[PDB]
Amino acid sequence: HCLIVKCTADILLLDTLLGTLVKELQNKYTPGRREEAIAVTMRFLRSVARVFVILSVEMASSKKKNNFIPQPIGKCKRVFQALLPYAVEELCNVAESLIVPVRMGIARPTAPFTLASTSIDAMQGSEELFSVEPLPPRPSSAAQAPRSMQWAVRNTQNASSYLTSASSLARAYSIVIRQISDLMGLIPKYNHLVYSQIPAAVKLTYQDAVNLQNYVEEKLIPTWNWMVSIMDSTEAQLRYGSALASAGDPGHPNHPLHAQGMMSARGDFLNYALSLMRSHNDEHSDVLPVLDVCSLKHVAYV
Amino acid sequence: HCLIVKCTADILLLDTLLGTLVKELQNKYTPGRREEAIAVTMRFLRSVARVFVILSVEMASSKKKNNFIPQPIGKCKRVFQALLPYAVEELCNVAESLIVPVRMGIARPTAPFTLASTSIDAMQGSEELFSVEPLPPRPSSAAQAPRSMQWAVRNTQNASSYLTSASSLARAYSIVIRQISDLMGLIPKYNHLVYSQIPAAVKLTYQDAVNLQNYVEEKLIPTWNWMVSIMDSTEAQLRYGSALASAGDPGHPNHPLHAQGMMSARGDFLNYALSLMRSHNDEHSDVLPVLDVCSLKHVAYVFQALIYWIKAMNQQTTLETGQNHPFFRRSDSMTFLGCIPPNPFEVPLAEAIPLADQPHLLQPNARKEDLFGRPNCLEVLPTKMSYAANLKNVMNMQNRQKKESEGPPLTSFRPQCSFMGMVISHDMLLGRWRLSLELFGRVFMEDVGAEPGSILTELGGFEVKESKFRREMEKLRNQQSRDLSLEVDRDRDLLIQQTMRQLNNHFGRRCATTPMAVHRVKVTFKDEPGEGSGVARSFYTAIAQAFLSNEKLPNLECIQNADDNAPLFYQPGKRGFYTPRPGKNTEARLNCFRNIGRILGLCLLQNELCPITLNRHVIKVLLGRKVNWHDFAFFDPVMYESLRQLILASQSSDADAVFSAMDLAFAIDLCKEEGGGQVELIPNGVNIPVTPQNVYEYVRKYAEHRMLVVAEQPLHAMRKGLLDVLPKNSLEDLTAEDFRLLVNGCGEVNVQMLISFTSFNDESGENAEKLLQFKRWFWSIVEKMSMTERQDLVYFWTSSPSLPASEEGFQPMPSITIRPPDDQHLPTANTCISRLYVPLYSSKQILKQKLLLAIKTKNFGFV
């Protein structure tokens, strides 16, 4: 953290560190040293990755497209560009670890927070998170939808919440997927975009690009299946509700274009449970599917 | 719907329908008709299943176990019992469809709702849901956790919500899993439970039961994997946090026992994300894992239901001088969940039972693990914290296991659970997820514990048993309109004789074979005939003091008209704690003891404390259940340990020489309080030497004789005395530790406990700050009181010294009235309402002096 975020007037230090790692990774003529260097490198890269994610999540994306891209994050990109084949693998694992609590439905509730606009107020939050000692041992002693789709929305026709935290983890996941794609994007030009840009970086070859791509695809299959299955199910429910809106009579008070506490709530819940049970066997021919899309913000990000 | 819920005065209609389906399902001789009938039947059954689930979800489970089981739901069960093999399959599919929206994390938010108590208001909601026309075509035009686990809870150390709907779907899922298990439960008896019960039902055979079971297992594997992986991950995080709490320094502000908006929230979220990323690669060695369990209510419901299934299967599966002899085996409370004993002959007494080592260590809400000493898919512990690796390992382990009826009639069906593991018995799983279970067993008890026979109640501590205790004792109290009245002196000799004589005249003029259930117990003193509760509390105290005194008794033969003067009780062994002294064993003595047993029954019936501190083996005998070597530690810890050392010496290379040098024989000295002299443990025992090979018998007979043979008649008398007042069933809930909390309450006056039950009233008219300073003064004085002075304070304030072990222990609650400022007057307490009244003293010194002088003026008048 401190080398990257707090040397706010230098870069040669970081370059020296990377040059050292690269030289030792190429120390093929010394026995064991190769594998030792790989193990060392990976253990460093996961630390870089944590620093990178924390920063990226805090800094608000500029809605005017600007190259502000503050130097902490630029430095992170430089590391990953210099150590590309390894950086890709560790990034897959960070991505994977961020999504699973949401993809299994487990995650904690939290209150919401504003993304930080200034570089300074973004950076400060990470200081208080990395300025830490291990515990000592015991002392010696949303624009609104059109009418053809409004029926499918929970609408009127701080405290913590589960959905806040589910959403923000999906937001965070997207960043890593973009960054992995970007690094895969550099590969064709790399025999130029190493030597014309950076003092030292890892040599790599077509065979390696193949194996990286194999690895990257595998790590995405679970989240892909989860996304696809939910999307298909949602699109089906929407299109059916539209076809019924065409064939049915808008004079009826239950038509999608036309449309107490505890018992109304138990009504809502029972309508939902009954719609769920019906839908499983296509026993649902003449009433709108019970649905709300506002929960699905995490699949939208993914 | 309408045939089942609205024909509220008929059943033959439904029977006719079922008979028709069954006949056509057996129409094998007509082509195609068979398959047509099956298709028809299934389409009907799914409709029945919807009706059933809707009803079952609405009707609130009766917390008193009742067979109300309203006839709509009974009819549903009849259908499924008549169409069993098909009913099972469709039920799997309904279960599956209910869980997936939660198991994928997708489900809608909703507001909460109350379960319906009456049958009527349950039924009405379903009417408005089934009274529907299809849309026409267009016209032609939570008890709080202990400190070792509090760090893992989001706690303080209508709108819709997602969690409401996630939870209620899990609640609904459990019902179907129970019902499937129940139907599988009927299969062995079915060739009787068809024809003896219902006009018509489907014939089925052993071969079919096999295939049903195959089908049912498969449909559960996904939810099983999801449950298991999350549980392992949770248990790992809990156990690691505990190990760190042991090794770390509690002086540090980040220790689990020691422990802005947007930025604090972004703090919380970042702490969580960082803990998540760290945990995946075991890069998490020196900070607590970020966790909250309150979200996990849906896995709690699913877990409870999945045990139900395996537990039912297991019921189908089950249908010396050795150290292995039952005397030496660990007993009630001691045998932990799926555990094997820390052997008492290898482990020090001090270590084997920290409660038997230190008797004052018992608390109402202590963890059972402390008191009795801390204890392939299941053998390897939940080591990894990451969710994902546990899931992957679960699937790999599952892959390891992957890698007319001829012969048996249904009555011979031998099912089990065998997949996921080779054999599961629920004790193993209660061994594996021990902490998660215990934590659920505090946090979710009000809700998941309301399921019928919910496994959480088996983790129910003292207060669960006490919740039953009030209900049973008040039920036994309110069934009778006849009081007990005792008029006694304060003098020890007169007090004993008068109490026992009046108890015999009350007992004997009522039927002596029926328990002495009474409306109220009333007591009046001679020359002070004030009456009722506080007087009776002062009496239970004083009569106990009279029995425990080292002074000589008056002749107990005086009690027969309704010398064996040895003191009634003595302290065996190197405890402060009592067993009856046998005296001359005359009938008059046993008659007295039989009345003392009645006093225990009476105090408990009234929910009043009796300060008689009896030893564990005495209490086990009173409960009517077996006494073990471990209870000899409760008889005499120093002798138990010395005999353990004698057994360690029997395992030494010089044991024959050491036992020769000790000169021990099968004869024991008894103290005067045990009847005195030297007694043979076996005939001719003085001439039979103890050897390293007979020592196990010697140590057994030594312990058995001292705990039981010495006092068998006093014990027989007291136990008869307890049964003379209370019915046997009331003993069945309790071990001696529980009986201690109910009989004696908390003997240790925990000042924080007393604070939480105390209310303050003000009559002084002085300002809230002076009142709060005076309240602080009072509690800081009570904190500085010795335990004796605290016990005297509660005795002065209430006419009893022990605190009740709970809120439920108080009748009525303790309270303090602050009176106008006066430094002359003393504090005074109406013990018949357990309320103290205190002047607003000008200084803490005067408050202390006046309070201590009052409670130490032990001659209390019975207000």
Author numbering:
A (entry chain A): 1385 to 1525, 1707 to 1722, 1773 to 1874, 1908 to 1950
B (entry chain B): 1385 to 1525, 1707 to 1722, 1773 to 1874, 1908 to 1967, 2015 to 2070, 2093 to 2120, 2160 to 2318, 2499 to 2799
Question: From the publication, what sentences describe this entry?
Answer:
Here, we used genetic screens to identify the HECT-family protein ubiquitin protein ligase E3 component n-recognin 5 (UBR5) as the E3 ubiquitin ligase that governs agonist-induced degradation of numerous NRs and characterized these interactions biochemically and structurally. We next structurally interrogated functional domains in the context of full-length UBR5, which is expressed predominantly as a 310 kDa polypeptide product in humans. The N-terminal region of UBR5 arranges into a seven-bladed β-propeller, which shows weak homology to a regulator of chromosome condensation 1 (RCC1)-like domain (RLD). Following the RLD, a large helical region forms the core scaffold of UBR5.
To unambiguously assign this weaker density, we expressed and purified a mutant version of UBR5 lacking residues 522–720 (UBR5Δtandem), which in SEC-MALS was consistent with a dimer (648 kDa). In cryo-EM analysis the dimeric UBR5Δtandem is held together solely by the rigid interface in the central helical bundle (bottom, S4A, and S4B). Reduced orientation bias of the dimeric UBR5 particles allowed us to generate an improved map at ~3.4 Å resolution. One dimerization interface is maintained through a large central helical bundle (residues 1,350–2,110), which is among the highest resolution regions of the EM map. The insertion following the 2nd blade is largely unobserved in our EM reconstructions and is predicted to be unstructured, except for the 50 amino acid region that folds into a classical UBA domain. The eponymous UBR domain, a small motif containing three zinc ions, protrudes from this central region and is also clearly observed in the cryo-EM density map. We observe an additional density from an upstream region (residues 2,022–2,067) wedged into a hydrophobic surface on the HECT N-lobe, promoting a predominant L-shaped conformation of the HECT domains. This region, which we refer to as the “wedge”, is poised to influence conformational dynamics of the HECT domain over a catalytic cycle and also scores as one of the top hits in our tiling screen (residue 2,050). The EM density maps have been deposited at the Electron Microscopy Data Bank database with accession code EMD-17539 (UBR5 dimer), EMD-17540 (UBR5 tetramer), and EMD-17542 (negative stain map of UBR5 dimer with RARA/RXRA).
